[PDB]
Write an enzyme that holds these catalytic residues in place. Structure first.
Site: not given
Length: 146
Positions: A64-67
């Site tokens: 779950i890549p996030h930013g």
């Protein structure tokens, strides 16, 4: 609930041919580009600034890549199913084939932890991951993720 207005069929890729995690992240910047108010270069840096702290892989082929970023005023996401697994530096050593990316504004954090937390819940279930790996249409992907 809001996961639905954040994941249109236009933000879902079912058979992406990607070789590296760097490549995967570049393609993500493109998917979330401008509809987030940011250039694909800025969307990329935002996701990588976080990945830098450590793999966003949850284990078992999922991640779950996030930013976050002051320039984003409304949460936006995407879903990617890789043709082949990708070395994600995951917590259990296994590569990943299911990637959910999330870009959030810098304001209602608590609400965001909810989306991430719920998603992780779905991904912890063997049968849910198995379905996401076999379904043919993007509509099925949405139905499962919601």
């Amino acid at each position: 609930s809001l996961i639905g207005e954040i994941l249109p069929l236009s933000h879902i890729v079912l058979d992406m041919e990607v070789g590296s995690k760097k490549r995967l992240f570049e393609e993500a910047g493109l998917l979330l580009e401008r509809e987030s108010s940011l250039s694909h270069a800025d969307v990329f840096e935002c996701l990588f600034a976080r990945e830098k702290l450590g793999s966003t892989g949850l284990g078992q082929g999922v991640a779950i890549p996030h930013g976050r970023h002051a320039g984003v005023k409304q949460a936006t996401g995407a879903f990617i199913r890789t043709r082949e697994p990708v070395g994600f530096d995951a917590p259990d050593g296994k590569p990943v084939s299911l990637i959910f990316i999330l870009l959030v504004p810098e304001n209602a954090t608590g609400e965001h932890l909810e989306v991430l937390s719920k998603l992780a819940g779905k991904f912890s279930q063997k049968s849910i991951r198995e379905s996401l790996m076999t379904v043919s249409s993007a509509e099925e992907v949405r139905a499962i993720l919601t």
